[PDB]
Design a protein around this ligand. Structure first.
Ligand SMILES: CN(Cc1ccc2c(c1)C[C@H](CNC(=N)N)[C@H]2NC(=O)C(=O)Nc1ccc(Cl)c(F)c1)C(=N)N
Ligand SMILES: CN(Cc1ccc2c(c1)C[C@H](CNC(=N)N)[C@H]2NC(=O)C(=O)Nc1ccc(Cl)c(F)c1)C(=N)N
Ligand SMILES: CC(=O)N[C@@H]1[C@@H](O)[C@H](O)[C@@H](CO)O[C@H]1O
Ligand SMILES: CC(=O)N[C@@H]1[C@@H](O)[C@H](O)[C@@H](CO)O[C@H]1O
Ligand SMILES: CC(=O)N[C@@H]1[C@@H](O)[C@H](O)[C@@H](CO)O[C@H]1O
Ligand SMILES: CC(=O)N[C@@H]1[C@@H](O)[C@H](O)[C@@H](CO)O[C@H]1O
Ligand SMILES: CC(=O)N[C@@H]1[C@@H](O)[C@H](O)[C@@H](CO)O[C@H]1O
Ligand SMILES: CC(=O)N[C@@H]1[C@@H](O)[C@H](O)[C@@H](CO)O[C@H]1O
Ligand SMILES: CC(=O)N[C@@H]1[C@@H](O)[C@H](O)[C@@H](CO)O[C@H]1O
Ligand SMILES: CC(=O)N[C@@H]1[C@@H](O)[C@H](O)[C@@H](CO)O[C@H]1O
Ligand SMILES: CC(=O)N[C@@H]1[C@@H](O)[C@H](O)[C@@H](CO)O[C@H]1O
Ligand SMILES: CC(=O)N[C@@H]1[C@@H](O)[C@H](O)[C@@H](CO)O[C@H]1O
Ligand SMILES: CC(=O)N[C@@H]1[C@@H](O)[C@H](O)[C@@H](CO)O[C@H]1O
Ligand SMILES: CC(=O)N[C@@H]1[C@@H](O)[C@H](O)[C@@H](CO)O[C@H]1O
Lengths: 335, 335
C-alpha cells in the first residue's frame, strides 16, 4: 500500500477538462518502459481488493467535481448552487504509477480471471493508459481481452456479486441526438451483438454446467442503472437496453428475442439534466443539452451483469469502482 | 481527378506508427457520416484504373518510409544505413475523402465486380475504414462481400492479370512465433478452408466453362510472392502456402490434396531480415526479431490469384495497388 501518482500525455493548451485537470494533477508519462520480465513467480491477485481502484476512483471523483460542475447539487437535503457552463468533454488515458520504493506486478496470463494465482508476472512502474469512462451496463473504450472472452467475479455463486465480462472483439455503438431536444438514439449492429451474446453465453454455460441461459433487461432501480447511462460531450445519455439484453441461450445456440430492423438494433435514449450522481449519494442538475448534433462513436469492450434449470442474467454497474477494476485487474502494487 | 485527403480515428497519445503518421497526415473522422443514395442513375466504374488506389499507395509508401526504417537499404550498388528501431505496428482504418468541389461515388450493387456499369450508386464524403494491410497471396482484415463470393479481374481471359477473389465469410488465420528464433507457423482450420475453396471453385467454374479447376502453389519468384508474406508487429513473416493452395475442384466438389493434422492446416513461416521491398525496387534489411511471443490473429477476407482439360490457379500480388483495389473497387472520385 502506498500513494500512487498519475501520468498522462495531457496537453496544457487543450481546454478539454480531462487535460485541464491532468496537467495540474498528473505528471508527463514515461518513455522508460522497463517492464521487468519474469517467470517462476507464483503470486496471487484479487481485483476486488485492490487499492489502485480506490485511489483512481477518488481522483476521478475530484476530476469530475472540478470539471463537470452542475447548476445545482442536492445532497443531504441541502442544495448548493453554482455556475454551469457547457464544457469540452472527451476522456484521456491515465497511467497509474508507483512511487519511490514500490513497483507494479502485472499478470501476463491472457486468461487470468482477476482472482487467484498467476505467475507469468512482470514488474513495471506505471500501468497502461486507462480511459476514465463513466458508464453503466456497458463498458466503453476499454482494453479488449487478448482472446477468448473472460468471465470475472469476486464470486459467481453469489448472485449479489457484480459480474464483469471482458470481451475480446469490440462491438461498436453509435449514440446520437440529431440536429424533442432531449430525444436521442443509439445504433448497434445485430449480428455482432448476436455473435457476442452467443460466445458470452457459451462462456457462461462453462461456469454453469448447462441450464437455459437467459439474457433479460435490468430488474429495476434508478434510471442510471436500469439503462445504459453514460456521458457524451458533457451531456448525460440514458439509453435503453430492453431490446439489447434480450435473448435465450440453449443447447449451444443463442437466439435473440429483441426487436430490430434491417440488421440494426436501435436503443431509445434520453438526455437528462437531473442525474443520482455516481460519486456520492445525491442528485446533480445540469443545464439543458447543447444545440447541434450530439454524437458519440464508442467501442463496447465489456459487460456488467447480475445473476438472479434456467440462469437469468441482467445488465448491471452503478458503482463506477467496478469500471476501474475492468482495467486494473491485472495489476498489484508491491514492495 | 483531385487531391484526396485522409481521415482516421488516430490517437495522438498512441506511439503506434500508423497513429503517429495519421495524426500528422490525416484529419479527424466524421463520427456520423451521411450518404446520399440515388435512383435513376447508371454509372461506369473501373477498379483497375482508379487514381484513389494510387494516392493511397503513395501515402502508405510515405507511411512505411517514415515508420518502418531499416538497417540497410540497398539499391543497385548504393546502400544507405541508419537507425532501425523496433516499433509498435498495428494498422488502423483509413478513410479517403474528397475535397471541396469534388465528391465520391459509391456503387451499392453487392455483386458488382469492379468493372463496367452499376446503377444503384450513392454519393458521399469519405470512403469506409480501410486498414492498409500489406500482404501477398492472402488479403487480411478487409471488408467481406455482402454475400456470394465475387470474382474480380481487369480481364479473366488474360492469364497475365491478377485475379482478386472477394470472400463473404472470413477465414481466421493465426500466425505465431512462440516464446529457432526466426521459426514461426500459421494455423488455419481445414474445414473453413475446404468450404471456402469449394465455393471459390464454383464461382470460378461458372466463369470457366467446364474444366478441372486446380489450385496449386506459386510457380516461382521472390519469397515475398511465392509465400504468404505479411507484417506482424513490425516483424516480416514469410509463411508457406504449399499445403494451403492445394486442391482439385471437379464435378461440383472440391478436394484438398494439401496436408493437415487433426483438421488443422499448419503453415511453416520464417521471419526474415532481408526483405525486395514492395514500395520500390530494392533490398531493406532489418534488426533480428524481437523477443517474446510474436502472434498475429488475422481474418482472411480475400484471395490473390493467377491463372496459368484443366485450369490451374496459383497464389499471386506483390503489387500492393491491388490490395488497395480490393477495398477501393466500389468508389470513384467525381466532379
Ligand atoms: C445500491 N446498490 C448498487 C448501486 C446502484 C446504483 C448506484 C449505486 C450503487 C451508487 C450510486 C448511488 N448514488 C446516488 N446518488 N443515487 C448509484 N449509481 C449511480 O447513480 C450512477 O451510476 N449514475 C450515473 C450518472 C451519470 C452517468 Cl453518465 C452514468 F452512466 C451513471 C446495491 N447493490 N444495493
Ligand atoms: C514483377 N511482376 C509482378 C511483381 C512481383 C513481385 C514484386 C513486384 C511486382 C513489386 C516488388 C518489386 N520490388 C522489389 N524490391 N523486388 C515485388 N513485390 C515485393 O517485393 C513485396 O511485396 N514484398 C513484401 C515485403 C513485405 C511484406 Cl510484409 C510482404 F507481404 C511483401 C510481374 N508481374 N512481372
Ligand atoms: C468466478 C471465477 O471465475 N472464479 C474463479 C474460480 O472458479 C477458480 O477456481 C479460481 C482459480 O484461479 O479463479 C477464480
Ligand atoms: C478470436 C476471435 O476472433 N474470436 C473468438 C473465437 O475464436 C472464440 O471461439 C470465442 C470463444 O471465447 O471468442 C471469440
Ligand atoms: C468465495 C469466497 O471467498 N467465499 C464464499 C464461498 O466459499 C462460498 O462457496 C460461497 C457460497 O455462496 O460464498 C462465498
Ligand atoms: C427502464 C426503462 O425505461 N424501461 C423501458 C420499459 O419501461 C418499456 O416498457 C420498454 C418498451 O420499449 O422499454 C424499456
Ligand atoms: C423486454 C422483455 O423482457 N421482453 C420484450 C417484450 O416486452 C417485447 O414485447 C418484445 C418485442 O419484440 O421484445 C422482448
Ligand atoms: C463514451 C465515450 O467516451 N466515447 C468516446 C468518444 O466520445 C470519442 O469521440 C472517441 C474517440 O476517442 O472515443 C470514444
Ligand atoms: C453467405 C453465406 O453465409 N454463405 C454463402 C453461400 O450461401 C453461397 O451459396 C456461396 C456462393 O457464393 O457463398 C457463401
Ligand atoms: C472478370 C469479370 O467478371 N468480368 C465481367 C464481365 O464478364 C462482364 O461482361 C462485365 C459487365 O458487368 O463485368 C465484368
Ligand atoms: C478484356 C478487354 O478489355 N480487352 C481484351 C479482350 O477484348 C480480348 O478478348 C482479350 C484476349 O486476350 O484480351 C483483352
Ligand atoms: C517457396 C517455398 O518455400 N516452397 C517450399 C518448397 O520448396 C518445399 O519443397 C515444400 C516442402 O514443405 O515447402 C514449400
Ligand atoms: C505442392 C503440391 O503441388 N503438392 C504437394 C506435394 O508436393 C507434397 O508431396 C504433398 C504432401 O502431402 O503435399 C502436396
Ligand atoms: C496482419 C494483421 O494486421 N493482423 C491484425 C492483428 O495484428 C490484430 O491483432 C487484429 C485485430 O485488429 O487484426 C488483424
Amino acid at each position: 500500500k502506498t500513494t500512487l501518482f498519475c501520468a498522462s500525455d495531457a496537453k496544457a493548451y487543450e481546454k478539454e477538462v480531462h487535460n485541464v485537470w491532468a496537467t495540474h494533477a498528473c505528471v508527463p508519462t514515461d518513455p522508460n518502459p522497463q517492464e521487468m520480465v519474469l517467470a517462476n513467480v507464483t503470486e496471487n491477485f484479487n481485483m476486488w481488493k485492490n487499492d489502485m481502484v480506490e485511489q483512481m476512483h477518488e481522483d476521478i471523483i475530484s476530476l469530475w467535481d472540478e470539471s463537470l460542475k452542475p447548476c445545482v447539487k442536492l445532497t443531504g437535503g441541502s442544495a448548493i448552487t453554482q455556475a454551469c457552463p457547457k464544457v469540452s468533454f472527451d476522456p484521456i488515458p491515465l497511467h497509474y504509477c508507483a512511487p519511490a520504493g514500490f513497483a507494479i506486478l502485472k499478470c501476463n496470463n491472457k486468461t487470468f480471471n482477476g482472482t487467484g494465482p498467476c505467475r507469468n508476472v512482470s514488474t513495471v512502474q506505471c500501468t497502461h493508459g486507462i480511459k476514465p469512462v463513466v458508464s453503466t451496463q456497458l463498458l466503453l473504450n476499454g482494453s479488449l481481452a487478448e482472446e477468448e472472452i473472460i468471465i470475472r467475479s469476486e464470486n459467481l455463486t453469489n448472485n449479489a456479486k457484480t459480474i464483469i465480462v471482458h470481451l475480446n472483439e469490440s462491438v461498436n455503438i453509435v449514440c446520437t441526438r440529431p440536429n424533442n431536444i432531449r430525444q436521442a438514439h443509439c445504433n448497434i449492429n445485430e449480428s455482432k451483438w448476436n455473435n457476442t451474446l452467443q460466445k458470452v453465453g457459451e462462456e457462461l454455460a462453462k461456469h454453469f454446467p448447462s441450464k437455459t441461459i437467459k439474457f433479460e433487461p435490468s430488474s429495476g432501480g434508478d434510471l442510471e442503472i436500469t439503462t445504459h447511462s453514460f456521458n457524451c460531450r458533457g451531456e448525460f445519455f440514458y439509453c435503453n437496453t430492453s431490446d439489447l439484453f434480450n435473448g435465450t441461450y440453449r443447447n449451444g445456440t443463442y437466439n435473440h428475442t429483441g426487436r430490430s430492423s434491417n440488421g440494426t438494433i436501435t436503443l431509445q435514449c434520453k438526455i437528462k439534466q437531473i442525474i443520482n450522481m455516481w460519486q456520492e449519494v445525491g442528485r446533480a442538475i445540469y443545464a439543458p443539452p447543447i444545440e447541434g448534433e450530439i454524437t458519440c462513436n464508442s467501442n463496447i469492450t465489456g459487460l456488467l451483469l447480475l445473476r438472479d434449470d434456467t440462469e437469468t442474467f441482467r445488465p448491471g454497474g452503478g458503482d463506477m469502482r467496478d469500471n476501474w477494476r475492468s482495467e486494473l485487474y491485472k495489476y498489484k502494487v508491491v514492495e
